[PDB]
Amino acid sequence: GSQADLAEALPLLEAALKALDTLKPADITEVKGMKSPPAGVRRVLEAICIMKGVKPARVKDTASGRMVDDYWEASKKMLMEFDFLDSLRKFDKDHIPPEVIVKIRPFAQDPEFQPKVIEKQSVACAGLCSWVIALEKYDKVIKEVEPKRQKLREA
Q1: Do the beta carbons of residue 12 and residue 131 sit within 8 Å?
Q2: What whole-number distance in Å separates Cα of residue 120 and Cα of residue 123?
Q3: Does residue 44 contact residue 128 with C-beta atoms inside 8 Å?
Q4: Is 23 helix (H, G, I), strand (E, B) or coil?
Q5: Alpha helix locations (H) across 23-146?
Q6: Comparing C-alpha atoms, which of 120, 138, 125, 136 is closest to residue 75?
Q7: Using an 8 Å Cβ cutoff, are 12 and 97 in contact?
Q8: Among 66, 134, 128, 130, which residue's Cα sits nearest to residue 96?
Q9: Termini Cα distance of the chain
Q10: Separation in Å, CA 133 to CA 6, 88, 101
């Protein structure tokens, strides 16, 4: 159980961080060019910022004609970065608030937030969602990954 838990998430987190290595900085900003990102990445790209606690943007509604806030303009601006992936990988999993995980709780099981599904519409972005769902797994195992105690897992 002890080694079965850590070894169950280890390959999950490492599989994500390594996904960004093969990726490129220009491959990310490519999303900032088009009018708007896909319906599949719209959630993933957000799962990266939400984990940090980024605020939305400010713009005028084109359909309402009033002052409103757009969390998209603030999100896409994160993809235009060339080192946007260097930050998520440099983030400390020991500082992951339950407020950011509770927002993607129902998504962790959603078929539109999995690394296997995102690999169909977003092979590159797939490396992101994989880290979001992995970081939550590695943090759940760390609770007993290497307790180094007795009277347990011992025959």
Answers
A1: no
A2: 6
A3: yes
A4: coil
A5: 25-33, 41-49, 71-79, 84-90, 98-101, 115-121, 126-141
A6: 125
A7: no
A8: 134
A9: 13
A10: 15, 13, 9
Do residues 119 and 65 lie in contact, with contact meaning Cβ atoms separated by under 8 Å?
A: no
CA separation for the pair 131, 57 (Å, rounded): 25
Which residue in this structure is represented by tokens 């992101």?
128
Instruction: Tell me which amino acid residue 100 is.
Output: V
CB 72 within 8 A of CB 36: yes
Distances (CA, A) of 112 to 27, 30, 125, 127, 128: 21, 21, 13, 14, 13
With a CB cutoff of 8 Å and minimum separation 6, the contacts of 112 are: 39, 40, 43, 118
User: What 3-state class would DSSP assign to 88?
Assistant: helix
Q: Tokens 């599949």 belong to which residue?
A: 40
Task: Give every CB contact of residue 137 below 8 A, 6+ residues apart in sequence.
Answer: 8, 9, 12, 13
CB 49 within 8 A of CB 88: no
Experimental method: NMR
What would the two tokens of residue 93 be? 């999993």
